[PDB]
Design a protein around this nucleic acid. Sequence first.
RNA 1: GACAAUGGUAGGAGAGCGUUCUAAGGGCGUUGAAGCAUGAUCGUAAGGACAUGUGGAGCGCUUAGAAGUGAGAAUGCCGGUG
RNA 2: AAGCAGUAAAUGUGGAGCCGUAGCGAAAGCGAGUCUGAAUAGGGCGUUUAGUAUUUGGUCGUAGACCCGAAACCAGGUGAU
RNA 3: GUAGCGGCGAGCGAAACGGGAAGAGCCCAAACCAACGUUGGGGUUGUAGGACACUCUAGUUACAAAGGACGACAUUAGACGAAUCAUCUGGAAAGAUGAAUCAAAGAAGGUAAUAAUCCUGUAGUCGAAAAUGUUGUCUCUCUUGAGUGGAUCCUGAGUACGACGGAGCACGUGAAAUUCCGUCGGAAUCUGGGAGGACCAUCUCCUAAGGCUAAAUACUCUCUAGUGACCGAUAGUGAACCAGUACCGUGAGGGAAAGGUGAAAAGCACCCCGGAAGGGGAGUGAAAUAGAACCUGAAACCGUGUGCU
Lengths: 192, 64, 59, 144
Amino acid sequence: SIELSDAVFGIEPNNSVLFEAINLQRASLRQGTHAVKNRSAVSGGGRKPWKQKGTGRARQGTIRAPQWRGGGIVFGPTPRSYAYKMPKKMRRLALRSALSFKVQENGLTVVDAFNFEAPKTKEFKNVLSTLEQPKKVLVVTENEDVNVELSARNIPGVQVTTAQGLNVLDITNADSLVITEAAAKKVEEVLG
Amino acid sequence: PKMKTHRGAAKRVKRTASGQLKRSRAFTSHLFANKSTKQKRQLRKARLVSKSDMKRVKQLLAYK
Amino acid sequence: GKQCFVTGRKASTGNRRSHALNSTKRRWNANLQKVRILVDGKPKKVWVSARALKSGKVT
Amino acid sequence: KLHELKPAEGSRKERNRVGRGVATGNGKTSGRGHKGQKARSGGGVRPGFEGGQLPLFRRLPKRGFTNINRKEYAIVNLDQLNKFEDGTEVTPALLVESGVVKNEKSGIKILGNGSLDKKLTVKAHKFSASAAEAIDAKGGAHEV
RNA sequence: GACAAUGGUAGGAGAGCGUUCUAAGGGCGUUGAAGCAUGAUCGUAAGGACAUGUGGAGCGCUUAGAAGUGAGAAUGCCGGUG
RNA sequence: AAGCAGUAAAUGUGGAGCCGUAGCGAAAGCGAGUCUGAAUAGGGCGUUUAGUAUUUGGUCGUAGACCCGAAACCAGGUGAU
RNA sequence: GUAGCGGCGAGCGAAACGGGAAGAGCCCAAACCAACGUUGGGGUUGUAGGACACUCUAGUUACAAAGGACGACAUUAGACGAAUCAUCUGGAAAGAUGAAUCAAAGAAGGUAAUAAUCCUGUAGUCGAAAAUGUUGUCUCUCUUGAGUGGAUCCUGAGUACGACGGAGCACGUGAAAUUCCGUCGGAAUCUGGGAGGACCAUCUCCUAAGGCUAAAUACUCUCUAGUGACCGAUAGUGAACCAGUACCGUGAGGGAAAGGUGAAAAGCACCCCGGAAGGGGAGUGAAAUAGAACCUGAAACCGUGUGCU
């Protein structure tokens, strides 16, 4: 079957918006979790090592100065978040470009509803090969699929998601997209 | 933290439509016998902050 | 220290300000007097403030 | 394709780093000049007063006061009302939902900058002298 | 292809090389990776390969991303050696 | 925007709020014009009125703020072998 | 970063409204009634409540008064758990080349080299004598609800408040309201009393001077299970190491340096020089210039030969 909306699948992709939407998602799961110590945090070094004058040595205040071995970092890492936000009218514009690009490259397959009621990985591998699908595929359905998401999750390169959980990065990564009839109708109304 | 505005400067100027500042006149406190009639009459008319002084205090009134 | 027996009168702390508004710490003691009052046992001399002495009190 | 990405031409640049070699032009002095107060670590003088000669906003006097009971109303010119159709009851409750007034501070005031060209009845808190004659000339009424 | 321009400190502006890590893609290696050593090699520069010895298990390349990203000197600090 | 929903997930929900569409005056106030003035008589500022949200780079402000270094001050303690 | 405060300098800096998380409110004094200043009943407020008068009708043991036998999960040991063989190079296969097989299991680590199918495991099911938790259904202990009623009573006293000297509210004594402390004066009793930024009048809202109260909030010496465009031995905690230890001070106190043989000790039997140490062979191993001062082994620097000078 061929069931398209002809509105959110036919627009031209916006490369400038599609690039800023991928950088936003990748930078949003970078938990910084990284910190070093400075002069105040290093243990010890509270007295002056030697008098300012009377010796042929340089003047030094603490054994934890940034030049001394074993203490003091000047400008190192610090715990911070990397996530930022973009307007709402640019989020939907980036999703339609990731969905229309697949259609332009001839990589969208509209399949009827699945009838998988028991988890079986060997059974799900057949329909992927029967439908002439590439190595990495994405599966989108209407709602949560028990006994379906349990399968196709041990196959290297197969990802199953929902209709409300589509991502700019999860879509651009797959070679082809496999969507059901009920799902393609749900995606056509949430977008555009 | 947020930037703090110059409270003393906010009591002496006001912003206009183009973006310039309206200022009062000095020498208007006392000693009016030492000045002439033409001098005191032309000191009631307000002026604007000059182009030079604007470059120094442009960020003291960011919220004004 | 010295504290009132009937109520909780005690000293406090403030500032001693001159004409130039110069700050210096100081104390404000209570008017504690030594009187002998009736007790369920033997009458005892205890520190009592002059505010509690007024309005009538046994001595 | 995540293996072929290109940003928009002219939107990205590389930051500047001072004190890294001499060929960059920002080497030893690092863009500060020679010795002075503006060359040490910790900035320089404050643009507010900077010491020295009497500052600017200390040589001019203060002026005026601030009213606490000050009232301010929104303004709807005439060229904004002509989007409605003839025979409509314009109401401060409708002007908000219509999308021409985002916030009513203490009421709506109808100014007369433009031309109405339409037949309406306008309700508002206050009116203007030239905005009350254009509503009634071509027909219509205004009610407070 | 014609004409003109190209000495430079403080300073302004533009274009590039290299180091570490992440993502996607695609490759190399016990028939010997990284590193270390030598050579008469290739680019306008920062720099890039190849062969031959030593080594005994990891590492490039392309496009983007993020920086504890470049050392000759501070009576600089620690180690080794005159 | 907090918040709720969701892998610490990048994502729908949430219009309290913020800027702009109109200025002028110390203010009452008036309004494409408003103040000064007995009087647009003249003059000052407006009739530019396409902005707004996120982000790369330059710079500024508050935080030690490009790095190293005093002679000093205060607070609580240790010492008459 | 608005109102406002401020040698109106530097600087300090709100609240209400609105949008959300969470959300039960109740006990004492007194008038009064039987008893001996005392026990119990009674009784708790502003759209004014109670005492008094007339007929009459759900335990919230986290506040609200507080003791006990009372079933399901959960914590503290664990048990099962699918699927590969062959041939080359090598000391050694997990690699390469061939055919195959599992998957609700392609997290991860080990194993003579790089393993979904070799070993511990993983997904998913099951399991508690005994102790401790979290949560219930009954039991046990408490326990009559509301209208009408001011002729007469009760509703917190050296208190409220004022002057004087200070402090605290964003607010520096200023026109300083609203809250506290020391000293001394010192009220009124529902026709009452307080507040609405000096103060008075009217008009609105609320009842001080007794006492309890769970949730949304802040933090981590710890326990358990996990993550990183975090470090990789001058780094990361001072400390990967038998470290607050050598060591240094009368003392309080101050404080380092030091990881790596090999897959496996299989750690060189015996012979030769030597008093020993250390070497030369022979052996072990894939490799001994991998021999415990043991992976790789840079520069400074110290040497032994030689081609030109």
